[PDB]
Amino acid sequence: SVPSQKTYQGSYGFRLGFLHSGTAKSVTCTYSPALNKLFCQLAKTCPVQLWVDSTPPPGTRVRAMAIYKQSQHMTEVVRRCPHHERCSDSDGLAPPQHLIRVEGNLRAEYLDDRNTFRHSVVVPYEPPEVGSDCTTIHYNYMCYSSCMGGMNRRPILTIITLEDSSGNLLGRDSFEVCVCACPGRDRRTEEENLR
Ligand SMILES: [Zn+2]
C-alpha cells in the first residue's frame, strides 16, 4: 500500500514548524516554505517543531516515515542505499537500513512494519517545557537523495503523524526532503526555478 499524506490538524490542532536558517552556502539544514521542502546535509541535525493548540493525552506518540513523492515510486520502501546500510554508523538503536533517525532520545523506537515492510521511527510526544511554546524533535537523514541503489535522485516526502497509544491517527503533516551537499544553494536554485 501507500501511507496517506493528507494534512490533518485533528482535534489537537497539530502542525509542524521549522526554524528560519537562511540560505548561506554553509547552512546545514534549511526549510523552504514556498516549496514545503527541507534541504539538509547528510546526517546533520534537522530541528522539526511540533505545534498543538491543546495538549494531547499521555501516551500520545509522534511517528516519522519517508515515502517517494512520485506516484510511480510510491509503493517502493524508502531505505538507505547498499553503501550506507553497510557503513556501520549505527547509534546503537537505529537499524542500519533506516533513512530517518531521531537524535538524543533514548525512548525512540524503530519499526519495520511486518506487513508493509516500511520503516519508521516513533517517540513519545512531550509537551513543551517551561518558557517554550512548542516541542522540537531532532531528525537525521542518513542517505543522500542522489545515492545510487537507494533514493537515486528521486524526491521523498517525510510524513509526521501524531498517534494515540494504539497507533490511531490524531494528526498528520508532511514536507518534501532533499538530502544534499549544499542545502543553501539548492534551496536558492529551486526557489528561483519556481519564481
Ligand atoms: Zn546512501
Swiss-Prot record:
Changing R107C: what effect?
Answer: In sporadic cancers; somatic mutation
User: How the protein is affected by changing V62I?
Assistant: In sporadic cancers; somatic mutation
Q: What is the effect of changing S174R?
A: In sporadic cancers; somatic mutation
What is the recorded phenotype of mutating N140T?
A: In sporadic cancers; somatic mutation
What changing G167V does, per the record, is: In sporadic cancers; somatic mutation
What happens on changing D133V? In sporadic cancers; somatic mutation
Q: What's the impact of mutating C87Y?
A: In sporadic cancers; somatic mutation
The observed outcome of changing N105S is:
In sporadic cancers; somatic mutation
Q: What is the effect of changing L194F?
A: In sporadic cancers; somatic mutation
Superkingdom of this protein's organism: Eukaryota
Name the reported effect of D113E. Answer: In sporadic cancers; somatic mutation
What results from changing Y31S?
A: In sporadic cancers; somatic mutation
Q: What is the effect of changing K25Q?
A: In a sporadic cancer; somatic mutation; mimics lactylation, leading to decreased ability to undergo liquid-liquid phase separation and activate the transcription factor activity
Outcome reported for the amino acid change (mutating K69N) = In sporadic cancers; somatic mutation
Q: Tell me what effect the entry lists for C46A.
A: In a sporadic cancer; somatic mutation; requires 2 nucleotide substitutions
Reported impact of L16M: In a sporadic cancer; somatic mutation
Q: What happens upon changing R86S?
A: In sporadic cancers; somatic mutation
Explain what the record says happens when changing E129D.
In sporadic cancers; somatic mutation
Q: Changing L170R: reported impact?
A: In sporadic cancers; somatic mutation
**Protein name per its UniProtKB record:** Cellular tumor antigen p53
Q: Which organism is it from?
A: Homo sapiens (Human)
Shown portion of the whole protein?
A: 96 to 290 of 393
